[model samples]
Target: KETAAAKFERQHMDSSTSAASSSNYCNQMMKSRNLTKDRCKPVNTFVHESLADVQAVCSQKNVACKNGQTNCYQSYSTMSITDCRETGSSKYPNCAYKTTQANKHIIVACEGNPYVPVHFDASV
Candidate 1:
């Protein structure tokens, strides 16, 4: 079974490539990553950095998550990332998305023994 940490990596990590010129980046990525499995994932963010760097966020200063959990931490440095938002006209199984790239500090929830990111909270 896939662990939460591993799921986070699959859904949000994209270290090798940055944003491309294709507007279909989101449509392709969202589907390829399985975010469009049953229904469109309204929004998601992908970090374009090494796994080690992203994991290290678990040791950064703690902050409140959107749900008010203090288990979240913000990245020490701004990172390259792409945000995928489902288009208003999108429908399940035929999910459409808009891609936006940016550099920002990411907030994530960490957990367990080694303390790794389990949830992508936000990018600021």
Candidate 2:
């Protein structure tokens, strides 16, 4: 079984994406990355940093999660990232995404023993 931590890693972490380009990037990635399996994931954030670096976010500044959870944390540094949002014409099984890259401080919800990120709450 894939733990939440592992799922987050697979779905969000892309440390070596060559900085990225184009709208089709997300369209391809959203499918290639398996986020479009059953249906489009709606929205997701991909961080261009190492797994260890992203995990360290648990120790960064405290922030309110998008769902209002207090377990969220923000990166102190602006990190390169790609935010994938499902397009209006996107239909299930034929997922289409709009990719937008930005340098923003990420916000994530962390939990569990040893304390690692469990959810990518948002990227600000």
Candidate 3:
């Protein structure tokens, strides 16, 4: 929980970083020209789907782009979950946290709305 002053200071520090305009060159146009990203609300996140495909992550928590494919962030990027996972079968490791081994883990971030891009292909 942050105080009003804290939020203001935080946002003020990142004033030069316009998150909305980050991918402007890639996008030909936006649905709304009123994309005033200066606002604090309306955050976005990214989620993985399959190996080759990905989607823009969305839910009740943020202003997600409804492009399709299971609330997965509607953007494709090379940084897929498969990239993170190890290839081939995994041998049972000793000293597990519980009965089951945690093969995958989603970063349960604390603050800033956890808005990571799903599949941002900006390098094309």
Candidate 4:
């Protein structure tokens, strides 16, 4: 079984890729990453930083998650990321996406013994 931390890496981490030059980036990535398996994920963001850097966020300033949990932390430094949003006309199995690139501080929820990111909250 996949751990929550591993799932977060699969769904959000893209350390090797710096930016999305093609408009089809999300269309391709969202599908290739298996996010479009069941239904179109309305929104998701991919971080272009190394796993070590992202995991270190768990030790950063603590913040409240959207669900009001205190396990979340905000990145102290801004990171390069790509946001993927499903197009309004998108349909299952043929998911369409809009890619937007930005640099921002990200928020994520961390858990487990090693204290790693398990959930992506948002970016600011």
Candidate 5:
């Protein structure tokens, strides 16, 4: 069984697979609804259910990620140290955050570089 801690930890995870092109995500989203569009170019952000599909990419975060700082605008009582920003260069780096277990849409900044977080799979 997965623990709440694990779930919370995943909230702040960042990855390249999650990236999506500007409209690619919308097109993919519209596909389910039969919404017709040109094409959703692949971006670095993940999608709604893709988070778990690429869990192997997320492991114990490195020390540099943990030593950073973050300003969690959302509620994060159960978030982990690894679940904050991506790297030290993120726009809102030095992050450790919590999760709502709901549909999450976040923008993370590693160090000082802000990275667009593509909503991948949440809890597997």
Candidate 6:
């Protein structure tokens, strides 16, 4: 089984990419990563930073998670990330994504022994 840490990487990491704002990026990645299954993943993000940098968010300032949990942290450094949102005309089996890249401080939820990021809360 894949660990949460590993799964996070597989689903969200994109360090070497200069992600384009083209719809093709979402079409390609969402399918290739298997995020487009029975339905489109409405909103997902791909972080363009090293794993180590992301992990360091654990030591950052704590914040409230979307679910109102306090397990979330904000990164001190701005990170490159691509936001993938299902386009309005998108439908099942044909998930179209709008790829938008930005530099922002990322928010994530950390957990377990070493307290690494388990969920990508948001980018702000």
Rank list by lDDT: 4, 1, 2, 6, 5, 3
Worst 10 residues of 2 by lDDT: 15-24
Leading candidate by lDDT: 4
lDDT of each: 0.91, 0.87, 0.24, 0.94, 0.28, 0.86
Give all TM-scores, in the order shown: 0.95, 0.92, 0.17, 0.97, 0.19, 0.91
Q: Which digits, one per residue and each the tens of the lDDT, describe model 3 over residues 1-124?
A: 8553243223221222223233331121111222123321222122223322221222212322234333223222332221112113322221111111111222211123343323322111
Better of 4 and 6 by TM-score: 4
Compared with the true structure, model 5 gives a TM-score of 0.19
Clash count, candidate 5: 32
Could you tell me the lDDT of residue 28 within candidate 4? 87
Across 87-108, the per-residue lDDT of candidate 2 in tens digits comes to 9999999988888899999888
Candidate 3: 10-residue stretch with minimal lDDT: 94-103
Question: Which residue pairs in candidate 4 collide?
Answer: none
- How do the residues 10-121 of candidate 5 rate in per-residue lDDT, one tens digit apiece? 4333333333334233333333322222332222222334334223223223122222434212212222211211223322222212211233333332221222222232
lDDT-superior candidate, 3 or 6: 6
**TM-score, structure 2 vs. true:** 0.92
C-alpha lDDT of residue 110 in model 1:
97
- Cα deviation of 44, candidate 5, in Å: 8.1
Residue 58, candidate 4: Cα error in Å is 0.4
- The predictions' CA RMSDs to the true structure, in order, are 1.0, 1.3, 17.9, 0.7, 16.1, 1.5
